[PDB]
């Protein structure tokens, strides 16, 4: 859905604590601002992507204190009040399964929505679903009993509503067993959250790559700025330092090109995640294989670091 916001002092990266390197950097003019406008443009968008995915409802719906969801047991995906952050049981698996520079001017800005606010929007969508069906999308939330919601669902896949009620015990026991298999699976597989981890790994690899470029000589006598300045005059220093300014600016223009290109991949995924939020969670899709394989009955969203997980429920 998003990636780490990153912002850089182009001056501190190229020229940290040197007025000389600053005066030589002025010879290139606006390029440091052009880079900072681009990284700001990325960074601002990361909030927008998260806002389009999670902030689809403008009322924070809350589940009733009593649970009579027809024998379906959402205790595994609803909030757990016993916890220091009010996230669900399956969300605490997700927040563990993803495992996640200062002095070089590189800075990681915070997201606008905290992981608590994302737990709130997630809970509001899920509480909206299990109490109010499609209606909490299309207007104000209207309550409906969950076994009745599941009847209207079965009619959405072209199955007759008695095929639910004549089997409701089995349908719930299969649902309850399936959600257990989600927990068991997510403990077991390391590749499960692989998309999210690969996004973290790429943004991290690019910052460590950008830092390690500070060690490169670029054909200068040293990478260390004061090794050049301490032994040379204004002329021979300008020759030498102007290679380091060239090389380091080329390193930022590389990082920012990668991060812009990588931001478009995250954008394309975030819009897909916003569409699946609207069409799999706030509704029931007729699209074949769009909301997971089978015929779609409903979906439950769960939050993850920089991402979203959908639990899609299907009649097979």
């Amino acid at each position: 859905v998003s990636m780490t916001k990153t912002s850089v002092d182009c001056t501190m990266y190229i020229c940290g604590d040197s007025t000389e390197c600053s005066n030589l950097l002025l010879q290139y003019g606006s390029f440091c601002t052009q880079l900072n406008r681009a990284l700001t443009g990325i960074a601002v968008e990361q909030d927008k992507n998260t806002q389009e995915v999670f902030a689809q409802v403008k009322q924070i719906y809350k589940t009733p204190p009593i649970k009579d969801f027809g024998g379906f047991n959402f205790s595994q995906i609803l909030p757990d009040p016993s916890k220091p952050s009010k996230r669900s049981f399956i969300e605490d698996l997700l927040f563990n399964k993803v495992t996640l520079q200062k002095f070089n001017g590189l800075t990681v800005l915070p997201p606008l929505l905290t992981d608590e606010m994302i737990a709130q929007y997630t809970s509001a969508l899920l509480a909206g679903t299990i109490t109010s069906g499609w209606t909490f999308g299309a207007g104000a939330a209207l309550q409906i009993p969950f076994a009745m919601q599941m009847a209207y669902r079965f009619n959405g896949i072209g199955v007759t509503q008695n095929v639910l009620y004549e089997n409701q015990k089995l349908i719930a026991n299969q649902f309850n067993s399936a959600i257990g298999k989600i927990q068991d699976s997510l403990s077991s597989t390391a590749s499960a959250l692989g998309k999210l981890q690969d996004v973290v790994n790429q943004n991290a690899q690019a910052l460590n790559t950008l830092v390690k470029q500070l060690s490169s000589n670029f054909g200068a006598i040293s990478s260390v700025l004061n090794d050049i300045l301490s032994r040379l005059d204004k002329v021979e220093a300008e020759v030498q330092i102007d290679r380091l300014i060239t090389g380091r600016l080329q390193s930022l223009q590389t990082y920012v090109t990668q991060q812009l290109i990588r931001a478009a991949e995250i954008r394309a995924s975030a819009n897909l995640a916003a569409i699946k939020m609207s069409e799999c969670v706030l509704g029931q899709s007729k699209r074949v294989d769009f909301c997971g394989k089978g015929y779609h009955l409903m979906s439950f969203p769960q939050s993850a670091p920089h991402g979203v997980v959908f639990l899609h429920v299907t009649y097979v």
Binding site: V57, K58, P64, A141, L142, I144, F146
Partner: protein
Amino acid sequence: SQSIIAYTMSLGAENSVAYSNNSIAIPTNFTISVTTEILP
């Protein structure tokens, strides 16, 4: 007396839903809403 206030943002109104195993809300009436959407 004007100032720049700073605050934790409200995500929406808090709104518990009147769900019971035999209760349903159905609209007696509707509104027709025209909305604008803008694309580059």
